[PDB]
Design a protein around this ligand. Structure first.
Ligand SMILES: Nc1ncnc2c1ncn2[C@H]1C[C@H](O)[C@@H](COP(=O)(O)OP(=O)(O)OP(=O)(O)O)O1
Ligand SMILES: [Mg+2]
Ligand SMILES: [Zn+2]
Lengths: 649, 388, 234
């Protein structure tokens, strides 16, 4: 019914985004069928001076769009969910309504069009298509990948949502149609602003100029194709013959056994810079140099020259080092530093995907022994370094395949820096290209299990003064499958435990805060939006054989079967557990967020959110600390202790 | 004269500058300074340009209420509930320590609830000849909140286009829980409007006093409004809907009774006679059902049941009608002319053709003297309760 | 002081032997269990129900009709028994409802046996702030009350007294348009006051039970009370 577009004619790919981002715009609106436009709409259109064209039927609207795109002749079309729903809707409408000259949507003349990113890319020949969803998923990690969450996070602005049901009601007044049109225009502006802020186009151009593939394939994501073309260019340049196209499996990293508990003294953390590429460059690991046929091959002779693989990975490493030097500069704009961080993360992922493509069974350059050898050498390096650091009368408490955590047990900063420098020199003396650096110095650290620890990182400012920043790794507070209530309570508990107060006061503070939470949850003063659980779907909702026992797919079939926009693979679903009164299990009582404020018989299940959402997080967090137990938390929250542990009378 | 919306942005700067009664608006909401931050915890909502609806705003004193809102110039102002903390700092408050504590008892009457009885105007507009139905509502509720419940401090304000709001602000009323508000709303509700059901008023032989004194009041205005002014018994589709409420067994006699007459007065007389004849041989109080279903006040549950629900503040300017929301004089409710209510354009014209008492030189003085009387009366209870 | 029915607040401060400590708990459990049988096997109005329940109350030395002054011992027995039983039946949610239902039934029985005229002082002795009306006031509003009456048949305003209550406390009544409201005060028949008394007792009982459960770990530290807190459903 409504389509709005914005156009810029001098967008530069070798310079920052233009300000303002747009120079032209237009919009078209049409009536559905049975209804009619509210009267005096033309007079209001002339009054407000809006570049809007009113059409008679849908066919005229399609003709207007296909005629306008020819005159504008865009080269990059950016949108949201273009590859999933929008383009299919447009193409199917063209076919069913018999629009003229569909080949105007691309840049080539054709006769018959295929249907279902293969079909879309074929139908849009000659024009790049950019989807903010794919690029955002590739560059930034968020909780949900809809338009609202992206606008909330990237742009820091709230966006109004118009439901499907209310569309019929707003056909009565001219102002309501104007509001709909303005909302569509605002959505287009938000999409353009997100694209300009993420700097998607320069990164895509740089990656395509590095790998050498086609630019349109870069914007669709995926890491195998770039590596395939990169290795193809590398081998063709040196007069080779490449394999023809096709018409767990090996040992990985080593993680040390941790020492669970709480640490008040300073902790050093030593980390390797670009471990696996450094190994490849160090031991001349390449296709030409290593013999092959689950067996680990032997290292090659050191006299032979460098192979194809390390020379190509060296360039990526050097580019990342170049970006970090620019990052080092002082007095930089806050947005520029984030753009550089995204750039270096993308380059790091490109460098580390070259190793991953060696173990992909469908890759054009599949070679298991090479990955097995690099993993074996990584494990050997980790073990040797751990032995050498233990030899110096020092303690190691954790390490994950490239890192070592040392408990210095001191309290002065200068000496711990000196010890870190000494160990750094001792480690770096052995190897040629590999290097080790002090990633950070911790103040207080709570280590729960493997890959689970919270800490305070010491950030120096000037003249020996230092601040502390809280960081988390692997806890339940950083995952998307837990309610915001439990995450906030866990964050409060972590903040209390890691403080400098006495161990006596923290228990009392936790008790008071837990009692307040227990009262407030039953009272009902907490908003509904904090009871949501978000889960991602891997397969299509109709394809799940166990649909009954899984809550999120159960909500997904409902939202597909009654609602509008259809959720597909990769999308996220939000569900809340409520009281139905049918005496089924908790996992079979999931309901949509909009299903609670519309119906009357449903109410929030406080027992589930108070005995299975809050309690497990605070019970797992406070395990290494004394004075707090599961039964005490159960009593504090107002629960029945009989379930958790009790038993003996 | 017709109000011009296009000049609304220009006049709004002047009205908020020299006409808005700031002193009494602050003295009312501060409630005598007895409570430690009773004003600083109040939620105001402002409707700015471009249809921007911002919800949480707070103020520190009179000076902030002056300068902050002068720099904004909102189209509409709404007053919320007194929250536990300052509403503008709601982002940083604790997880669940933010909840409402007190609010006045608000009652809203909307003209759109009388669409199935109305035969003259549109759903969104009014005419003089039917506006009396509004007063027929007030005298039913005004008595009910005065004698039955004993509430003393009530303010009746013109909504601006199609209703009158009632604020109850007695000291005990402001702290009532939601259940008591729902109950007091139910006690005043009689017309059970279903899914477009013809019959919406039901009763038994036993008569509650609240539903009998209401009949005693409605009898005074029924003959003037329904039988002469409304004249709902003139042609076939005028009394077919009336007969729909009546059991079909009497339609045969009633059609012949209404057929040979000329105006609604004898229509009502014959209808009463036949209804009494039906009662004698069979009670259901047929003659009262039609009056109660055509004329009893209807209230919205949603506007009043909640504790944090926003409502338009007095002395605001409606974007369309331009009329200032003015209080009603309780002792001359029958002497109120809706179309006499001054417009922002008219008062601005008066001000242009002219310690700050410039509202006294404008026609707004008689309509703010009632506000001053309300505050003076409330101060009487203030000093009679605490000091005695 | 009206030791024949009492809202249980102001926990006691006396000290007792442990044998009496266990005997009080077991006797209260026995009586409260037999209330279940009496309420299940019979109906709430037969003379046999009253006779059996009062005979059992006499058997276990528990308070009943107030016409014989100094039964201080049954008063003390019941006062200690309720508080000692509060600790046990506050653990599981299947036992809290069982406690509340049968205690409310017992209070209903104790209320039904007050003769006619000691009720007024009791209402003031439980912090309830209720009032009665004289005969002249009853005659003044006779027609108004009988018109405001519920589906109760007949216009005869019997000898049952009419009570005067703040309106906010009669939410369950004036919501249904079944009472008379005047000057912010509700007028109710004596039959319906039982419902509001029990409804207001229930909330306080539940609040007391909840506040005891969370401060009950401190009491488990005593080694002499472990058998009692775990073997009252054994
Ligand atoms: N996304 C990934 N895909 C494939 N391999 C990965 C990925 N992330 C990490 N690895 C492997 C290869 C890396 O050499 C090794 C250690 O990674 P990590 O500690 O994140 O950084 P890094 O050692 O490459 O250096 P840097 O600290 O400079 O980013 O783990
Ligand atoms: Mg590293
Ligand atoms: Zn009218």
């Amino acid at each position: 019914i409504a389509m709005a577009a914005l156009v810029h004619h001098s967008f530069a790919l070798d310079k920052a985004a233009p300000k303002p981002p747009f120079q032209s715009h237009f919009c078209v609106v049409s009536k559905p069928k049975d209804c009619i436009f509210p009267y005096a709409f033309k007079e209001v259109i002339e009054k407000k001076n809006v570049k809007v064209e009113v059409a008679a039927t849908e066919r005229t609207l399609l003709g207007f769009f296909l005629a306008k795109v020819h005159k504008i002749d865009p080269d990059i079309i950016v949108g949201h969910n273009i590859y999933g729903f929008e383009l299919e809707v447009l193409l199917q409408r063209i076919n069913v309504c018999k629009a003229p000259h569909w080949s105007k949507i691309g840049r080539l003349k054709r006769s018959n069009m295929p249907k279902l990113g293969f079909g879309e890319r074929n139908a849009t020949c000659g024009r790049m298509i950019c989807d903010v969803e794919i690029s955002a998923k590739e560059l930034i990690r968020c909780k949900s990948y809809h338009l609202s969450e992206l606008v909330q996070q990237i742009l820091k602005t709230e966006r109004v949502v118009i439901p499907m049901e209310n569309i019929q009601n707003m056909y009565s007044e001219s102002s309501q149609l104007l509001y709909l049109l303005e909302h569509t225009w605002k959505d287009a502006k938000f999409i353009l602003q997100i694209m300009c802020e993420l700097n998607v186009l320069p990164l895509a151009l740089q990656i395509t100029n590095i790998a050498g593939n086609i630019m349109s394939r870069t914007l669709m994501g995926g890491r195998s194709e770039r590596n395939e073309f990169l290795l193809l260019h590398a081998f063709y340049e040196n007069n080779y013959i490449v394999p023809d196209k096709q018409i767990a499996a090996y040992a990985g990293g080593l993680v040390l056994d941790p020492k669970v508990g709480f640490y008040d003294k300073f902790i050093l953390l030593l980390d390797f810079n670009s471990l696996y590429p450094s190994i490849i460059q160090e031991f001349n690991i390449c296709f030409t140099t290593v013999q092959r046929v689950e067996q680990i091959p032997e290292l090659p002779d050191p006299s032979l020259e460098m192979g194809i693989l390390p020379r190509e990975i060296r360039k990526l490493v050097e580019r990342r080092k170049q970006v970090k030097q620019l990052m080092k500069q002082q007095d930089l704009n806050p947005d520029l530093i984030l753009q550089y961080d995204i750039r270096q993360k993308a380059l790091k992922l490109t460098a580390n995907s070259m190793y991953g493509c060696l173990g992909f069974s469908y890759s054009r350059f599949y070679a298991k022994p090479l990955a097995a050898l690099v993993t074996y050498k990584g494990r050997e390096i980790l073990m040797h370094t751990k032995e050498m650091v233990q030899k110096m009368n020092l303690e190691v408490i954790y390490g994950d395949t490239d890192s070592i955590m040392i408990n210095t047990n001191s309290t002065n900063l200068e000496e711990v820096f000196k010890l870190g420098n000494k160990v750094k020199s001792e480690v770096n003396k052995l190897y040629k290209l590999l290097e080790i650096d002090i990633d950070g110095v911790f103040k207080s650290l709570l280590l729960l299990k493997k890959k689970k620890y919270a800490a305070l990182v010491v950030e120096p400012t000037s003249d020996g003064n230092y601040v502390t920043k809280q960081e988390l790794k692997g806890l339940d507070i950083v995952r998307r499958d837990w309610c915001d209530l439990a995450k906030d309570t866990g964050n409060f508990v972590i903040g209390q435990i890691l403080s400098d107060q006495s161990r006596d006061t923290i228990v009392e503070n936790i008790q008071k805060r837990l009692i307040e939470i227990g009262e407030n949850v039953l009272n009902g003063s907490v908003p509904v939006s904090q009871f949501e659980i978000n889960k991602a779907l891997t397969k299509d909702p109709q394809d799940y054989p166990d649909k009954k026992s899984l809550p999120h797919v159960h909500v997904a079939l409902w939202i597909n079967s009654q609602g509008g926009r259809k959720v597909k693979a990769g999308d996220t679903v939000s569900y809340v557990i409520c009281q139905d009164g049918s005496n089924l299990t908790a996992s079979q009582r999931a309901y949509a967020p909009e299903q609670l404020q519309k119906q009357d018989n449903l109410t929030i299940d406080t027992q589930y959110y108070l005995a299975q959402q809050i309690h497990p997080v605070v019970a797992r967090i406070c395990e290494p600390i004394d004075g707090i137990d599961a039964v005490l938390i159960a009593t504090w929250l107002g629960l029945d202790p009989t379930q958790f542990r009790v038993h003996h009378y | 004269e017709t109000f011009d919306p296009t000049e609304l942005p220009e006049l709004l700067k002047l009205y908020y500058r020299r006409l808005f009664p700031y002193s009494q608006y602050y003295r009312w909401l501060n409630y005598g300074g007895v409570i430690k931050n009773y004003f600083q915890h109040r939620e105001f909502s402002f409707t700015l340009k471009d249809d921007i609806y911002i919800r949480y705003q707070s103020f520190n004193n009179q000076s902030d209420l002056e300068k902050e809102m002068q720099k904004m110039n909102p189209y509409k102002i709404d007053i919320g509930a007194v929250y536990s903390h300052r509403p503008n700092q709601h982002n940083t408050v604790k997880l669940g320590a933010f909840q409402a504590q007190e609010k006045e008892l608000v009652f809203d009457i909307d003209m759109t609830d009388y669409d199935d009885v109305r035969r003259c105007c549109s759903s969104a507009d009014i005419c003089p000849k039917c506006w009396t139905l509004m007063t027929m509502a007030i005298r039913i509720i005004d008595r009910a909140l005065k004698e039955d419940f004993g509430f003393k401090h009530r303010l009746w304000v013109y909504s601006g286009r199609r209703g009158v709001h009632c604020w109850v602000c007695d000291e005990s009323v402001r702290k009532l829980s939601s259940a008591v508000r729902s109950g007091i709303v139910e006690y005043l509700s009689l017309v059970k409007g279903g899914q477009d059901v013809k019959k919406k008023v039901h009763l038994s032989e036993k008569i509650h006093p609240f539903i009998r004194k209401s009949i005693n009041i409605i009898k005074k205005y029924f003959e003037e409004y329904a039988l002469v002014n409304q004249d709902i018994l003139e042609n076939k589709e005028s009394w077919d809907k009336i007969l729909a409420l009546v059991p079909e067994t009497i339609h045969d006699e009633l059609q012949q009774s209404f057929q040979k007459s000329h105006n609604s007065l004898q229509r009502w007389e014959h209808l009463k006679k036949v209804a009494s004849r039906y009662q004698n041989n069979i009670g259901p109080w047929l003659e009262w059902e039609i009056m109660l279903q055509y004329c009893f006040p209807r209230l919205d549950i949603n506007v009043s049941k909640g504790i944090n629900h926003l409502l338009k503040s007095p002395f605001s300017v409606h974007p369309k009608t331009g009329r200032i929301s003015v209080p009603i004089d309780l002792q001359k409710v029958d002497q109120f002319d809706p179309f006499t209510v001054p417009t922002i354009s008219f008062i601005c014209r008066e001000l242009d053709a002219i310690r700050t008492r410039d509202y006294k030189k404008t026609s707004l003085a008689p309509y703010v003297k009632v506000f001053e009387h309300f505050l003076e009366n409330l101060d009487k209870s203030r000093k009679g309760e605490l000091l005695k | 002081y009206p030791h024949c029915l009492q809202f249980y607040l102001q926990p006691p401060s006396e000290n007792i032997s442990l044998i009496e400590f266990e005997n009080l708990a077991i006797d209260r459990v026995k009586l409260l269990k037999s209330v279940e049988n009496l309420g299940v096997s019979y109906v709430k109005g037969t003379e046999q129900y009253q006779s059996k329940l009062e005979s059992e109350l006499r058997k276990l030395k528990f308070s009943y009709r107030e016409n014989l002054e100094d039964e201080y011992e049954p008063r003390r027995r019941d006062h200690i028994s309720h508080f000692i039983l509060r600790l046990a039946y506050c653990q599981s949610e299947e036992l809290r409802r069982w406690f509340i239902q049968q205690e409310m039934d017992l209070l209903r029985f104790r209320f039904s046996i007050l003769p006619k005229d000691k009720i007024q002082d009791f209402l003031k002795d439980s912090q309830l702030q209720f009032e009665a009306i004289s005969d002249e006031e009853k005659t003044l509003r006779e027609q108004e009350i009988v018109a405001s009456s519920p589906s109760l048949s007949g216009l005869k305003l019997g000898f049952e007294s009419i009570y005067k209550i703040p309106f906010a406390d009669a939410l369950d009544l004036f919501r249904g348009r079944k009472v008379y409201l005047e000057d912010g005060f509700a007028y109710v028949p004596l039959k319906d006051i039982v419902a509001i008394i029990l409804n207001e007792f229930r909330a306080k009982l539940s609040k007391a039970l909840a506040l005891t459960a969370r401060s009950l770990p401190a009491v488990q530290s005593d080694e002499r009370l472990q058998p009692l807190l775990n073997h009252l459903s054994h």
